[PDB]
Design a binder for this molecule. Structure first.
Ligand SMILES: Nc1ncnc2c1ncn2[C@@H]1O[C@H](COP(=O)(O)OP(=O)(O)OP(=O)(O)O)[C@@H](O)[C@H]1O
Ligand SMILES: Nc1ncnc2c1ncn2[C@@H]1O[C@H](COP(=O)(O)OP(=O)(O)OP(=O)(O)O)[C@@H](O)[C@H]1O
Ligand SMILES: [Mg+2]
Ligand SMILES: [Mg+2]
Ligand SMILES: [Mg+2]
Ligand SMILES: [Mg+2]
Ligand SMILES: [Mg+2]
Ligand code: NA
Ligand code: NA
Lengths: 116, 527, 65, 151
RNA sequence: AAAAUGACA
RNA sequence: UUGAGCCUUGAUGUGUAGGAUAGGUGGGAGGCUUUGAAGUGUGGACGCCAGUCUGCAUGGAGCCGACCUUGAAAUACCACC
RNA sequence: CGGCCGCAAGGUUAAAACUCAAAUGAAUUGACGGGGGCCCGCACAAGCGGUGGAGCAUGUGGUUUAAUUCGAUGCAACGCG
RNA sequence: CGCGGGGUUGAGCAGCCUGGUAGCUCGUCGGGCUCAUAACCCGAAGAUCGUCGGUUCAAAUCCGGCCCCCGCAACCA
């Protein structure tokens, strides 16, 4: 309820999964939808198409709030990084702007090594 | 608040539930679970007061109008759609039927004058002037339009037969005891309509459904009736499962803690027993060994019936090969062409919504109903086993279980291969003598499975097999069907049954009959 | 990284802010530090860049084209 | 295949009607090197089909074939250890060949009588999105739109 | 993704 | 702030068949309207979304009830809940 | 082994008996790589028809017999001399 | 010859848990893949459930008797 008319859409795209959370400008989540939760278990959730389904599903479960202006914040690498922004404009949402919030540490914590 | 006070019932020669007692009352919904053949509906009848226990008392509520739903959705077929609902209320229906002996008896006496004078007054008290006024509106509210109110109950699809049988219980109803409400499987739209209806209005309810998801979405308690008694766990269903499994593995663990703490005590008593310096110590725990008294482990009533369908004669080329049916009853034909082939495939799980006509399509295919004009034909070597949606014409004529199961079979000994197929599916000597017309639900379905196993047919029509099964017989039948090497059709509404094994799924609609997308997962994905 | 261009985009086309940080640091800082693998991959990095100058200086060939 | 390219194989037009589409249809259902029977079956399966459809050849056959041809077909794309199949667009030269191949495969079934009635009943039911041959265009479409997750 | 081995003259 | 009990007041409630969103109990057919109406324009809240509803001035004093399809009779009113 | 150093792990100085006619460095020609590039063959891909299942003819392994004559036995022996 | 635990396919094991389906992992055999052996894929073979009797329609299961094996006990001034 409360009819939020101006909100945010945090896209947390990873190598494995693409997860979309729509929230108001105060950072209080309304609804969320992921790539793997749309019947894309396994390697398929790491597909750009699975993000398109995830974004369109996240348009629902928040359509009652009547959000009209979005402020998308992309984050992280992955193939479901760009195909999901274009899936928010295809549901009628008006993206006011696009921002990238990706953590680039200034040589902070030591990274892992676990691949050979 | 209705209470059971040490209730026991003995059917045959072994008690069903031994000395049960529990309190029901409040805005809660005690859905109860149990393997078919073990209490459940009998306990519901005891609570309703229709049947009395062999020991114990109903301890009935004073005048609070227990409102009930029965297991049988076909027991009402002659009373009209507007008659069943008005017959739901006893004291009204009985007085109406007695007052109907006025226009049919052309003779009236002095006592009969008083009786007709006072029965009309009782009818007025019981609102007979609005008895049919309050019924049609409820029937329209549930979703049954006017056009079929005075029509007979026979000409109704069972998904709506249940829709009317539910409304039959909706007359000033506290304490509604609903028997198996699904079966004649609802689409799923009707199921969600049910769940919203049930969980919106506030009353005390007792559900007995076998549908885990429906019970999760509806109920708050679980009055499981499994081992020998009715034990109630507060939980929807996934709390009940993790309660009744953890509390049983705990029983096994707390019993192994005794079975293994007796072992080393016995090792001591066996080693230092004749020793003069330690005999007084061995005899000190040889007597605490026998004062432990481990707690016994009962037997669960849920079992997997071993059912296996063979093949008498293998046909090769193709089986069905239907061209044009165009079957109709009252409206424009429910379907027109339905040209298709079989090719000795598997299933083609016919499905739709309630009232489309899948059951009558299967009736036309099996030949007990013939189309308006068309040809079906089967292979000259085709042997057809049939599991009807409603099977009441079969369990009749008062035969024993043994006699019913022996009336089948081709060349088999009377003592084995027919008393063995019975024991492979949950039957014993104390049960092979009870009458056929008294078994309940899943047991009748299992008897039908047994007759199919002995007839060994090539083509299994099998309308709606998963109706009254245990949820433990469902997967047994699933495995039996997927290991069966013949040809079959079936119109089950279950999701992960068609999704489990279907290959040639055929949906049916008033306009477009789709056919064979694939796994039906691809069908539901394309849709 | 931020693009406002308030009224007239209707289309992201923010490759200018996509080819600045996303490719390099993010998909590199996950592992492979080793404190001396970069110092030897760098020695090999333009042991071949100067090799192109020889190919740049290899313009004096006939090849009959 | 490897180095060169093949232009096309020149197939003579059908004797009875000047159609290059019908002539290839005869050859596809032709079996064991006997074109005498295949043209006898097709010609019989068209006259008894045209009279039902009311017109000679085009709506009898070309319409009966334009509604059975596909648009998207599926194939496998093992790249570097992958195991997924993909749907791909078919070229216009393979649509007719696929359509004719599907009809005969779905017409060699339905065993009732001689091929002349087997095929004519197959084409007439396939001319209205009803037959078992025209069914295959639906399955191949479902397998083409129910796995669009990869492109 | 998995692929180990082959007595001397 | 959130529950439960009580007192007072105000809102509150269809069919199947309709001019109409009729709780019974039946008392009754003449009250009700101007200690300003019939209907006009201004909107609160509820809303088997058609309508009730009430603050509101002006406009100034007709409407209702009966018959009526109907299981029932109509905020003609009141008491009892 | 001995000496020195060290909390310890050990470091440092430093042999012999016996045994082989070799061990090793750079480079050359081939072969090979689950190294790279280019190209070809019904090699794969797209298709059509088969073998492997059944009966029978025939050849070969074995087993048997007095003898079941000798030879061929990856591709390139097995409707072979 | 006093007390316990066991005998199921070539080997190690369930099922005996209140009676109605002879099963798991290795292994054996016949094909396939390979230059060839292993690995891998397909198909298959077996046993008197120690023996002998007993109620049961039906016993690996419940009961009685016997045989075989493996453990323990057979005490102190
Ligand atoms: N009147 C009767 N006389 C004797 N035995 C009966 C009688 N009614 C039922 N039984 C048997 O005793 C048990 C009681 O059946 P009941 O109707 O309680 O089953 P249920 O557990 O409710 O079954 P379901 O889950 O299929 O509805 C069943 O095993 C049945 O075969
Ligand atoms: N004997 C009959 N006379 C008239 N109408 C009938 C008759 N039998 C069925 N119908 C009608 O045909 C339609 C479908 O009937 P059917 O029994 O085949 O239902 P169904 O789609 O299989 O549904 P379900 O099995 O869930 O009851 C319904 O509209 C029903 O009213
Ligand atoms: Mg690690
Ligand atoms: Mg080795
Ligand atoms: Mg060196
Ligand atoms: Mg052969
Ligand atoms: Mg020879
Ligand atoms: Na029952
Ligand atoms: Na049906």
């Amino acid at each position: 309820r409360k009819q939020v008319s101006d909100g945010v859409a945090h896209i947390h795209a990873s190598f494995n999964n693409t997860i979309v959370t729509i929230t108001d400008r105060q950072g209080n989540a309304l609804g969320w939808a992921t790539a793997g939760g749309s019947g894309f278990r396994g390697s398929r959730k790491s597909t750009p198409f699975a993000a398109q389904v995830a974004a369109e599903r996240c348009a629902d479960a928040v359509k009652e709030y009547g959000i009209k202006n979005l402020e998308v914040m992309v984050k992280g690498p992955g193939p479901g990084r760009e195909s999901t922004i274009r899936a928010l404009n295809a549901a009628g949402f008006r993206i006011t702007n696009i921002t990238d919030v990706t953590p680039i540490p200034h040589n902070g914590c030591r990274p892992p090594k676990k691949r050979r | 608040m209705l209470v059971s006070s040490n209730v026991t019932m003995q059917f045959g020669s072994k008690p069903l539930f031994e000395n049960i007692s529990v309190k029901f009352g409040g805005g809660n919904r005690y859905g109860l679970i149990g393997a078919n053949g073990s209490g459940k509906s009998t306990f519901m009848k005891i609570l309703g007061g229709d049947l009395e226990p062999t020991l114990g008392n109903v301890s009935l509520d004073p005048n609070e109008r227990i409102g009930k739903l029965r297991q049988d959705q076909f027991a009402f077929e002659e009373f009209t759609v507007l008659d069943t609902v008005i017959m739901g209320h006893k004291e009204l229906w009985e007085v109406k039927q007695e007052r109907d002996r006025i226009y049919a008896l052309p003779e009236m006496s002095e006592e009969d004058g008083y009786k007709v004078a006072d029965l009309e007054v009782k009818y007025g008290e019981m609102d007979g002037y609005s008895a049919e006024a309050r019924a049609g509106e409820l029937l329209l509210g549930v979703g049954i339009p006017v056009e079929q109110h005075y029509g007979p109950m026979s000409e109704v699809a069972p998904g709506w037969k249940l829709r009317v049988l539910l409304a039959q219980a909706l007359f000033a109803d506290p304490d509604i005891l609903l028997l198996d409400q699904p079966t004649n499987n609802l689409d799923i739209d009707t199921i969600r309509w049910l769940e919203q209806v049930l969980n919106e209005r506030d009353s005390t309810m007792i559900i007995i459904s076998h549908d885990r998801h429906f019970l999760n979405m509806v109920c708050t308690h679980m009055a499981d009736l499994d081992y020998g008694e009715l034990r109630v766990y507060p939980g929807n269903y996934d709390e009940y499962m993790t309660a009744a499994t953890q509390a049983r593995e705990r029983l096994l663990a707390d019993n192994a803690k005794k079975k293994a703490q007796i072992a080393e005590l016995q090792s001591f008593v066996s080693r230092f027993s004749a020793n003069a310096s330690k005999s007084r110590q061995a005899t000190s725990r040889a007597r605490q060994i026998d004062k432990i008294k481990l707690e016994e482990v009962k037997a669960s009533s849920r079992q997997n019936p071993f059912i296996r369908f063979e093949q008498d004669k293998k046909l090769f080329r193709n089986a069905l090969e239907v061209e044009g049916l165009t079957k109709g009853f009252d409206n424009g034909p429910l379907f027109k062409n339905l040209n298709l082939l079989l090719e000795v495939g598997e299933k083609l799980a016919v499905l739709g919504t309630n009232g489309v006509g899948k059951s009558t399509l299967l009736k036309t295919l099996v030949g007990d109903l013939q189309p308006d004009s068309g040809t079906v034909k089967w292979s000259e070597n085709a042997r057809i086993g049939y599991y009807a949606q409603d099977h009441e014409y079969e369990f009749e004529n008062d035969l024993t279980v043994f006699e019913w199961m022996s009336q089948w079979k081709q060349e088999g000994d009377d003592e084995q291969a027919v008393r063995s197929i019975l024991g492979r599916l949950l039957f014993s000597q104390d049960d092979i003598k009870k009458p056929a017309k008294v078994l309940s639900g899943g047991e009748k379905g299992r008897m039908l499975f047994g007759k199919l196993m002995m007839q060994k047919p090539n083509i299994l029509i099998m309308d709606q097999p998963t109706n009254h099964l245990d949820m433990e017989s469902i997967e047994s039948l699933n495995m039996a069907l997927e290991l069966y090497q013949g040809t079959l059709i079936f119109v089950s509404h279950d999701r992960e049954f068609v999704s489990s094994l279907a290959t040639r799924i055929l949906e049916i609609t008033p306009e477009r009959v789709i056919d064979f997308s694939g796994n039906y997962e691809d069908y539901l994905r394309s849709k | 990284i931020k693009v406002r261009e308030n009224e007239p985009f209707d289309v992201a086309l923010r490759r200018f802010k996509r080819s600045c940080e996303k490719a390099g640091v993010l998909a590199e800082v996950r592992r492979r530090e080793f404190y001396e693998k970069p110092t030897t991959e760098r020695k090999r990095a333009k042991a071949s860049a100067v090799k192109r100058h020889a190919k740049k200086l290899a313009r004096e060939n006939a090849r009959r084209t | 295949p490897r180095r060169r390219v093949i232009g096309q194989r020149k197939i003579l037009p059908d004797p009875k009607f000047g159609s290059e589409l019908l002539a290839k249809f005869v050859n596809i259902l032709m079996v064991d090197g006997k074109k005498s029977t295949a043209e006898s079956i097709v010609y019989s399966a068209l006259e008894t089909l045209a009279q039902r459809s009311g017109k000679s050849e085009l709506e009898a056959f070309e319409v009966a074939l334009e509604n059975v041809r596909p648009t998207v077909e599926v194939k496998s794309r093992r790249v570097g250890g992958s195991t997924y199949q993909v749907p791909v667009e078919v070229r216009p030269v393979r649509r007719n060949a696929l359509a004719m191949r599907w009809i005969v495969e779905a017409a060699r079934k339905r065993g009732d009588k001689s091929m002349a009635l087997r095929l004519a009943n197959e084409l007439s039911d396939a001319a209205e999105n009803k037959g078992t041959a025209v069914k295959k265009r639906e399955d191949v479409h479902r397998m083409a739109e129910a796995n669009k997750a990869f492109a």
